[PDB]
Design a protein around this ligand. Structure first.
Ligand SMILES: Cc1cn([C@H]2C[C@H](OP(=O)(O)O)[C@@H](COP(=O)(O)O)O2)c(=O)[nH]c1=O
Ligand SMILES: [Ca+2]
Length: 129
């Protein structure tokens, strides 16, 4: 997989973000995770977390997996890095997301995320509390 540039357009919620990619605005959905919706429990915390992460970053990158790059809503499907740190993994590690939506052929970082989920769960963090 390879990291590609993008710039923040705007934070949306825990697992979506509006970024500029190849010079075009796109809503991105974070691969392999599910944050609560803003209205659900930990929804606000997930949203705040991703927002702080992207807004504080000097360098945002997107990394597409092997399979489909856009979902049925036209959202880009990627791993998103903030100053080299993977937001998808960070959310799971903090118990602010679950590993979810693992579809064959877009699952490169599946095991990395499940390991983070196991740690979050051990620590009874947030959603696991
Ligand atoms: C993460 C991801 C979501 N989706 C679609 C599946 C779900 O369909 P449905 O909308 O029909 O439930 C939806 C969940 O996204 P959200 O968790 O953002 O709602 O997004 C994909 O198709 N591929 C993916 O990789
Ligand atoms: Ca969600």
């Amino acid at each position: 997989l390879h990291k590609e540039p993008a710039t923040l357009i705007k934070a949306i919620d825990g697992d979506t973000v509006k970024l500029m990619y190849k010079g075009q605005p796109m809503t991105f959905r974070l691969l392999l995770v599910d944050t609560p919706e803003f209205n659900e429990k930990y929804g606000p915390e997930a949203s705040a977390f991703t927002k702080k992460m992207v807004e504080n970053a000097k360098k945002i990158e997107v990394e597409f997996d092997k399979g489909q790059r856009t979902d049925k809503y036209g959202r880009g499907l990627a791993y998103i890095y903030a100053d080299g740190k993977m937001e998808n993994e960070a959310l799971v590690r903090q118990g602010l997301a679950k590993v979810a939506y693992v579809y064959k052929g877009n699952n490169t970082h599946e095991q990395l995320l499940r390991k983070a989920e196991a740690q979050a769960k051990k620590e009874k963090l947030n959603i696991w509390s």
